[PDB]
Amino acid sequence: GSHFYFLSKRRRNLLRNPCGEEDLEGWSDVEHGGDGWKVEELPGDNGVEFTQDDSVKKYFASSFEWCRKAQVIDLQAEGYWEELLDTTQPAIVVKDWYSGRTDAGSLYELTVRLLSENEDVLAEFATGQVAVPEDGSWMEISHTFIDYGPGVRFVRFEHGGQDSVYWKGWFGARVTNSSVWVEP
Ligand code: NI
Fold first, then answer.
1. What is the secondary structure of 101-149 as a DSSP string?
2. What is the CA(153)–ligand 1 centre distance, in A?
3. In the chain, fewer beta carbons within 10 Å around the N or the C end?
4. Which domains does the chain carry?
5. Binding residues for a carbohydrate
6. Residues annotated as binding site?
7. 106-115 and 67-74 as β-strands: parallel, antiparallel, unpaired?
8. Dihedral class, residue 67 (left if φ above 0, else alpha if ψ from -120 to 50, else beta)
9. How far is the CA of 12 from the centre of ligand 1 (A)?
């Protein structure tokens, strides 16, 4: 019956369609560079298996110019009261998984912002451009926002990838299993 108990019980991934099971539905500000985003089934051509969740069967593949996509989550509509967010400032945990092919290098970027109701940027985590592992292995990136102050209403998740070779097709970074949740 404590708050810790309820927030633990209500913890769930607030991002829609994290793996591409619904194609691009639920993603906004979609930028299709080169040949655009494409959804592929695991394990990818010249790629490795997703040993970590098993319910993950698909990923998004990028191309030869930047492919980006974003989602904005309304924390209040998901039932996190403004008073709770202002006073307790519970942990907002962001994770993403990325990999590349073994026949070509690639690059990935993630930018996550906490936003007020008027879209003021209250906190920001940005990777910059990251070199994807050459060996095809899946890598997790994780960030926890805490002590971010009052006023947080939205989380804007944005990520992207491109290849390092400039080749027609889908040789860029692959992303999947993206998540945002609130934990005590
Ligand atoms: Ni309790």
1. -SSS-EEEEEEEEEE-TT--EEEEEE--SEEPPTT---EEEEEEE-S--
2. 25
3. N
4. 1-184 (2.60.120.260)
5. 101-103, 166-167
6. 101-103, 166-167
7. unpaired
8. beta
9. 18
Torsion of CA 74, 183, 53, 39, to 10 degrees: 20
Q: Are 94 and 142 in contact (CB under 8 A)?
A: yes
> Smallest Cα–Cα separation from 177: which of 60, 9, 27?
60
Ligand 1 centroid to Cα of residue 54, in Å, is: 32
Which residues fall within 8 angstroms of residue 118, CB to CB, at 6 or more apart? Answer: none
| Integer Cα distance of 75 and 116 in angstroms | 11
Contact of 90 with 184, CB cutoff 8 Å:
yes
Q: Side chain identity at 130, as an amino acid letter?
A: V
The phi and psi torsions of 67 (rounded to 5 degrees) equal -110, 125
* C-alpha span between 127 and 125 (Å, rounded): 7
Question: CA 123, CA 120: separation in Å to the nearest integer?
Answer: 9
Q: Report CA(5)–ligand 1 centroid distance (Å).
A: 5
Measured in Å, residue 17 CA sits from the centre of ligand 1 at: 32
Q: How was this structure determined?
A: X-ray
Number of Cβ within a 10 Å radius of residue 181: 20
Residue positions counted in the chain: 184
